[PDB]
Symmetry: D2
Subunit: 440 residues, 4 copies
């Protein structure tokens, strides 16, 4: 699936539509980042810049100029074609091909931005700029504005109003188009296959990073070159640590392994979590905790629909978790009272859902306590979980169990579509999947 040229064009026009007449919006590309000495990390374009261009080069700036409600044009600043620096540092789009390729009216050399930007801003009333996003961008913008302010003798004037476009653009990204849903649907599929593969390849004795290897290879063969975030593979006590990326321990027979991994496909992120027994067979204790988490997820998947909210659904999940924990003796007391005092937090300390899109923890206003009413087009995760520390004062057989199950969904007119249901989560289906894989 792909984001078409028509769509990129459409997004720009949707932004211009909200801009005041006599203004310009400046969107900067992300800077290259050093990994060590003279080597850089694989380039990752700025999500907002990507959203409007699908252009994967640094040192580029998109300038949308709105003259009035019926006239507007675009100018792109990007690296010049250097049939010398390209033979040495990869191909560049250049100014000649850019107009047709990216659908912009004009393209200029990034090396000329300081001599050209102020001329584009001269006389405008408003400039839309994400101040503070990038230092190199603020230098360029401030430099241009200063030049205009001090150039009255050259008949230059600077726009006195600067508006951060992030709130507007992020509200746009919060609602996915059909094209975006198709791409996210594919990212979910690819991510699901990777998780399925991890469960099938897992064997006691293997190291956590081995499953990471399986997952990344699967992402890659489907065209999703990079993960959308650092892969987590925590078996045993490591599963109780939410930010466990070391993936250095040997997986033991009898332990559970929690895997949170997602690919980045065409810029969009997949975000799946599956927890399963390293030896392919849930013990009674593990199965008891798992069922509570699964009930939470299945219930949430049933509840999420237009009209409700993350906060509301979270309330249902808290009740389910407290009830379950009381039944097992992990929590003692009256359910409603325990809920009233959030007695669940020691075991479920993170949110149930977060937006998903060009960023795994996507942009968009959540509302106080994530109470914003859900509408069709919003994409979010559903990731309930229970983590019982090795030293928690609870029945012995539950200590050291970390479980999380996470799916990605898109809100629809009548409810929601689960984009990652293609990888099993029911305990019996997991054990059957692993058994089938093991007889080879």
């Amino acid at each position: 699936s792909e984001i078409s040229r028509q769509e990129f064009q459409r997004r720009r026009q949707a932004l211009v539509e909200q801009m005041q007449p006599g203004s310009a919006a400046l969107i900067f590309a992300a800077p290259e980042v050093t990994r060590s000495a003279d080597s850089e990390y694989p380039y990752r374009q700025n999500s907002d810049f990507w959203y409007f261009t699908g252009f994967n080069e640094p040192e580029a700036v998109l300038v949308l100029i709105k003259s009035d409600d019926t006239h507007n044009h675009s100018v792109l600043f990007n690296r010049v074609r250097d049939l010398t620096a390209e033979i040495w540092f990869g191909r560049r789009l250049g100014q000649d091909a850019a107009p047709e390729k990216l659908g912009v009216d004009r393209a200029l050399a990034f090396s000329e931005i300081n001599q050209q930007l102020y001329q584009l801003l001269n006389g405008l009333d408003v400039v839309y700029h994400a101040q503070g996003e990038y230092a190199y961008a603020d230098v360029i913008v401030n430099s241009a504005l200063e030049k205009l302010r001090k150039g009255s003798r050259q008949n230059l004037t600077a726009p006195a109003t600067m508006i951060d476009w992030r709130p507007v653009v992020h509200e746009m990204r919060l609602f996915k188009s059909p094209e975006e849903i198709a791409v996210l649907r594919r990212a979910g599929e690819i991510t699901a296959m990777a998780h399925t593969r991890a469960m099938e390849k897992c064997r006691p004795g293997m190291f956590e990073y081995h499953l990471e290897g399986e997952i990344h290879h699967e992402f890659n063969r489907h065209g999703a070159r990079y993960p959308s975030y650092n892969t987590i593979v925590g078996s045993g006590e490591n599963g109780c640590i939410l930010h466990y990326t070391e993936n250095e321990c040997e997986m033991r027979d009898g332990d559970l392994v929690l895997i949170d991994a997602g690919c980045e496909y065409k810029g969009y992120a997949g975000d799946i979590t599956r927890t399963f027994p390293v030896n392919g067979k849930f013990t009674q204790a593990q199965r008891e905790i798992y069922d509570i988490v699964l009930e939470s997820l299945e219930t949430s998947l049933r509840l999420y629909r237009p009209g409700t909210s993350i906060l509301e659904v979270t309330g249902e999940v808290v009740r389910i978790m407290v009830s379950g924990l009381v039944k097992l003796g992990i929590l003692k007391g009256d359910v409603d009272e325990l809920i009233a005092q959030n007695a669940h937090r020691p075991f479920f300390m993170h949110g149930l859902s977060h937006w998903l899109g060009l960023d795994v923890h996507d942009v968009g206003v959540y509302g106080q306590d994530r109470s914003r009413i859900l509408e069709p087009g919003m994409v979010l995760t559903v990731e309930p979980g229970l983590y019982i520390a090795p030293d928690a004062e609870v029945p012995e057989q539950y200590r050291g169990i970390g479980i999380r199950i996470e799916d990605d969904i898109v809100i629809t007119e009548t409810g929601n579509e689960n984009l990652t249901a293609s990888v099993v989560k029911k305990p019996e289906e997991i054990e059957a999947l692993m058994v089938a894989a093991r007889k080879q």
Copy 2:
């Protein structure tokens, strides 16, 4: 193979040995780096900081204090243990375990560095600091020195001399110890196995990124989680681009594919390049260019030894290349006359060798035109190559051919040890290898 505790201790003492009495050396860890929004790239420790600690955490500073020719001690600044935040930011070493684990005399919370550093520098004559390496480090150091300069009323004095320790430390890293050679040897084997696998899995129709996937999976299964640089897989015309990391094209029958990839094992880098026929059979034209590059490599591998230099060996390679190109009609004229003319540069535009170590393009002084005399312990690459542009005015059949063959060697008392010879490069051996793999 790995680096022992004794070795990290040995390196610190080797640096202290060169420091003037009454001084302190400050070595900062690398900052965490943003990939997008709130997600970060997998952490990569600063090579120099790693060299002295093998500690993989950010917000850490190693302080080596030399009182006199016989008395010196160490202080480490690192993140505090937060048994209520490590659940969200992975496990941390902390101050209690650090002394024993890292072999430092004392450990303090990084959060206290501004209240403690100046006290450590107070009264010293010299401070060794890599000014300009990291902005956050310069802020900390300058802040401490300023506090001392302005604190005469508190009996504080700042060292007036600041020395950059990079030249000294890099000269140290230039000569590998037996332990380092063992680790680099393992990195070479792992990298070789990945390249072998790539040749065995290659089939027309597969995408360039597919081989990248095979390679990274192989690195990973051997414990080398990350590549030491971005993998290059350029088939057909892409092979003529040195910095080709897009790896997006479908590999066509009849084209060659150039693969430059290396793993990062225990911090050290492998760096291998192998070029081979996508269809497992070198055409005549491809084989003719290949032989010139292979001879260049094979000869260089015989020449490299103590007493010669990269510049000297490069001279031999230039002869070999010019001769070969003249015989094929790519170059026309007298050999010696063409050499004097560097008529080879349009086809071989990069260096023959570069140091190798904690960084793929390792630190260390090369001397003018890389004329420094080689000695035992130095580790370098040997990577001759020929790239004939698709539009080069040469015999038609050679256009669009990009070939490079690269091995990693360590200079020994009597010559050199090839660390990457475990992956074939002989054209017959390559074709035979691809044959034996395709029977399955």
Copy 3:
């Protein structure tokens, strides 16, 4: 004459009147400035900050908050009263007295601005800030906005719109109130008396700086402690240099001395220039150049009235100068022809007038080529001049003559009021003033 506390309140309300509802304007005080090592220059408050407060302390910020068309209040950030430390630095207003003294609703310690500013901006739609005016101010503002942007979980929101209030405030300062005119009138008198004294004290043999001394002493005895700009005293060839502040040469008999000096009274500037013979008697050549400049000034003083412009009057002065220069043989050719090619520029290279107010070169839009139509309330200078280089290719006697005559005027309903006519400029009156000065 002074600025009443009622006027400061009036100015604030005039700014608030133009602000959008749900916004806040931030006006920062000027930073203290180092003269050398630990000594500072006498403090000079930021003109705009002064305009709204008349408060002469650094580390102070005026915050005007407009809730709606009828509700608005003010908050002042300023240094705290350090009863046990002011014994060292200086009496400070403090928070208790500020409200009644400065007429602000509330006052807070400047040391708490980072903990309070964001709370004041939280939830507003617009923030008026002079970005780029002061580094320390931008740090404070950006820090507060960043805190709001990243505090959605604390229900904090940052105003997305930032407007530079300078254009609005400067347009306000361009039109002087009756109170301001009274103060400027006094500044003009004081400055005039100083210039009169300089002419009366001048004698050959005295140094240029001696006249500077006379002038500053006169400013001071009338309560105008500091000059509004660096005093210029250029005799002989020094008069041909516009920015001559060395005032180091001995004044020779037969030379003219040009004096440009103005006091700063209650924040407002006087700006007068008078040129006269050091020996009290104009030489024929000097008198001939002087008359052209005087005619220019006299005609301009006659012309300036509502409806015309600096550009228009300048045109008249150019004709007068070209005509005069042709008659003396300094310029050769047809008057209109010479005018058309600006043949006057080598001798008159600066503007005829500039706004005057809290800054000698006051704020306010001039319009292209200073063509803005003049209206009552505008205060400007009238300073024609002619400078004939010592090596100018003109009749020998005129070489080395630098003359400028400048007065300060305020545009009125029927014309303009000359605020500095109390110091003579008619050549006869100057010579009479000087011979009579001696008579004692």
Copy 4:
């Protein structure tokens, strides 16, 4: 008196003498400073830059290059001669005249410093730079060093050692040469005459700033254009405030007036304080406090000589003050016990002496608690004082009295020379001086 060309040359060589071979010292001029909008404060050169050049222009850098123990040369970077920018911003030395005028071997345009500095530092082992002195200078130096570090392919190398030359240079400035003593002697005379004049002009009813005016006019007529620090004129209760520069109150009959003012002559500072009765007659109470301060000063003037220290002499003064205060009933108890508990601090809270030179609070190491042994050539002030708050719990008649008497001395072979004894301080002499001023 003035500093000769030979002395500037001498100072440079004295610095070069202490530099290691193969190094360069960089000394930057002070930046111009904004007073308001586009107007600047009168330029004040950086004391250290001035010390080696006597050059009063900004955007200039002195580079002293030491090749070996016998070879060294100098390069000056300064503004270029611009016949236009000069007619507009004053005359400039330029490159042609600089060599001869400033006694430097070569001069280059400041506008070319970034293209030239690194070439001068290339290959050196040490660079002497006052890091942190000026931001613009650190930018230039860091930029040059970075260029060298990254230019190994161009055979460039950066000096790894950076030494702060301030400690060395300030130790030099601490010992005045004969020429400097002559200039400081003249500064003292000029300052003394100004103070004498202030006493003679003082009359009840006059404002504090009026005396300031008299003082500055006196400084000026002797060629000392600017004060070395902001003039203090505190009468009545204002005298109890050490940093009282408002000088805004009307001087009352019956009050004392404390005047601390000093001129800046040829870069050197005078620093005198005299306190006297506004009405020319000391009261019972005022005279009693005055005598204690005078005794302190006279005793210190006797004591100061080579071999003692500021700390030692301070001890004597403390005894004198405590004894005196006990006799008047301001302090109650045993002298020695009171001294042991510093019961004098509430009335004498500042130091007795500070170095004096190119800066009023001159550079140079004081030693712990200012215990450094005094030697011939050191110049310091002697300024004992007593300040009794208006609300101090002491005999009512002493409340609100602020008195300080300060002279400037130079340590000699046998004792010290008082540079400011030409202005009276004995109470009888003060009253007599003021009387001989109201002559009819």
